[PDB]
Amino acid sequence: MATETNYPVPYRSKLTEPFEPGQTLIIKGKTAEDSVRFTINLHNTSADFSGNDVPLHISVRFDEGKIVFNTFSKGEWGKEERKSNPYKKGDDIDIRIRAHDSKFSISVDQKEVKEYEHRVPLSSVTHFSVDGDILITYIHWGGKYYPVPYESGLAGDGLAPGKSLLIFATPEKKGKRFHINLLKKNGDIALHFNPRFDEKAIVRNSLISGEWGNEEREGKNPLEKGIGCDLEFRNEEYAFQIYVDGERFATYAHRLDPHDINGLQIGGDVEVTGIQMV
């Protein structure tokens, strides 16, 4: 009888619109030493049909040590496709499903481990459910195919104090570095976040009147080439709180007045899959 606070299993959710290419479904949670398996299903039937048509069925098994993928259509399960389960009976799981026009790309712990070709229409995916021996801690879907270099304004309030900008990205396998700029109307950059793999460091700096300031670097640099990451920039009272994959990576004293930060740029050797302002 886990706390209904988190996502109670069985967890049944309905998408706003059908799952589109470029969108990602993220499922995070915890398992116990007694968990045998849990499932993730991309369902159909807006009329709520528990087990009607299932474009993609994911079964991670600690008893079999494998992750199973299959499709249910025309009232029948099809042929299974298997992959090794980086298992870990007990401890956190991070599974992400990204839709593309010819298949689903599934990543475990932000590492691409499976390409599942569509067998039935992706557009039939109108729901998703999670069940089994798992304690769901986080679920989220969205994103799109973001072109990089990327550049856009931020809604209206922009990244104002008390708000946080979440960016899901994947540094390129053969990339050297990439950057993210949080700018102001005149072109000044309140925050330049520049992961440089060749320097094994993440450079943070500000561009004021065309002149770069003092470089703040050195730190864990928890990023890895080819491995997806969750970047979060929380604009607080005295400084930006920079989170990387759940943990605070650094703090950056405001050098420019917060407020009016409504410019965003992303460049370098990186793939961007999600951007949300909370």
| Domain residue extents for the chain | 1-148, 149-278
Longest dimension (CA), the chain: 65
Q: Tell me if 1-148 shares its fold with 149-278.
A: yes
CATH of 1-148, one of 3.20.20.70, 2.60.120.200, 2.40.30.10, 3.30.300.30: 2.60.120.200
What is the CATH code for 149-278?
2.60.120.200
**PDB experimental method:** X-ray
